[PDB]
Design a protein around this ligand. Structure first.
Ligand SMILES: CN(C(=O)CCc1cc2ccccc2nc1N)C1CCCCC1
Length: 369
């Protein structure tokens, strides 16, 4: 798989993008890899923050579907025109496909001033595809129209960030130890169930249904470990406690202040490891993934951001979790797999782990209905 190794680039906080081409002749764009959504959507107008944008008038293989899409979200929108064209991924499988494409023609707080990407790649399922599930997501089209296997994996290494998106298989050189799989609970987002949370090998001891209220998902497009509300303060409370070897203001933990140290020495030890238990492949079986403080204390370009934060929408295992591990989205088998990443950052004392099996009863009761 070397061709696809290291095919991802980005900037701290600005996401991961892969190079893609659209239309005939090919028009190259940097597209952001997002497992949190299901639309393939790209800039078509000369927005001032865009380096490049899709010029449909140049493409003989462009086809208007004569329909629009409106995608509002919490603090922003994008809006555009549906059509189809031929899509290819240079540092990826050697194929070319006809995919749905949303020509973005108006947006608000969508493009990042500074960033170097011009569209988004929705890697999740039809159910959450805008405007409706009849709009076949890109990856569905790829597997349907070639012999590329129904799976992809992501190794986010994290100014310049890099990684790999291995379309069609798994590159063993990218991870150590063993993959452990958690089932994709439903095919809309990459929904999974967390069955237990420790902070310093010490159970948070909360009703496990809290952890997946209303949703726990895996999302390359989100930066933070975002936790649900109750869970969040409970973790904070425990994190706050394990970190009593020093004080910080309330606004910090709340993601309203930065927190400053001296570029002489990185402390680290006074911060707790976080363990998440995820439902295993078998009845009553689970496994745990373990992040270090390097994963959740993120330098801003010497003050870091506490990269765990609260949420209304559920749990979101963002880059914080994902850069710890090789993540395999085994869509063929309705499961997500986790292994200790080969490129993740680690000191000499502690390390990110994927360990099992453990015994965990009533795991299905941790889901929400
Ligand atoms: C707020 N953002 C998040 O990723 C949070 C969760 C998320 C929201 C989305 C909203 C609309 C379309 C796709 C989305 N994908 C996501 N993963 C991003 C918006 C898209 C580009 C990067 C910043």
């Amino acid at each position: 798989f070397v061709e696809m190794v290291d095919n991802l680039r980005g900037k701290s906080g600005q996401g991961y993008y892969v190079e893609m081409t659209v239309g005939s002749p090919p028009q190259t764009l940097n597209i952001l890899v997002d497992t949190g959504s299901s639309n393939f959507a790209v800039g078509a107008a000369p927005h001032p923050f865009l380096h490049r944008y899709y010029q449909r008038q140049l493409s003989s293989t462009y086809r208007d579907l004569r329909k629009g899409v409106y995608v509002p979200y919490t603090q922003g929108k994008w809006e555009g025109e549906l059509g189809t064209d031929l899509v290819s991924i240079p540092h990826g499988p050697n194929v070319t496909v006809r995919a749905n494409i949303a020509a973005i023609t108006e947006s608000d707080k969508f493009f990042i001033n500074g960033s170097n990407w011009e569209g988004i790649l929705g890697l999740a399922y039809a159910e959450i595809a805008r405007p409706d599930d009849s709009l076949e997501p890109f990856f569905d089209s790829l597997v349907k129209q070639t012999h590329v296997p129904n799976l992809f994996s992501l190794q986010l290494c994290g100014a310049s960030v890099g990684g790999s998106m291995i379309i069609g298989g798994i590159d063993h050189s990218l991870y150590t130890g063993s993959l452990w799989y958690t089932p994709i609970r439903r095919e809309w987002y990459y929904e999974v169930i967390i069955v237990r949370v420790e902070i310093n090998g010490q159970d948070l001891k909360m009703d496990c249904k809290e952890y997946n209220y209303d949703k726990s998902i895996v999302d390359s497009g989100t930066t933070n470990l975002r936790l649900p509300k109750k869970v969040f303060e409970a973790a904070v409370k425990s994190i706050k406690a394990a970190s009593s070897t020093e004080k910080f203001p309330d606004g910090f933990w709340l993601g309203e202040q930065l927190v400053c140290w001296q570029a002489g020495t990185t402390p680290w030890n006074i911060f707790p490891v976080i363990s998440l238990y995820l439902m295993g492949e078998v009845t009553n079986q689970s496994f745990r993934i373990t992040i270090l403080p390097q994963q959740y204390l993120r330098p801003v370009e010497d003050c870091y951001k506490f990269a765990i934060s609260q949420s209304s929408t559920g749990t979101v295992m963002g880059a914080v979790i994902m850069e710890g591990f090789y993540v395999v989205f085994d869509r063929a088998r309705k499961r997500i797999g986790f292994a200790v990443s080969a490129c993740h950052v680690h000191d000499e004392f502690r390390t990110a782990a994927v360990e099992g099996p453990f015994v965990t009863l009533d795991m299905e009761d941790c889901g929400y209905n």
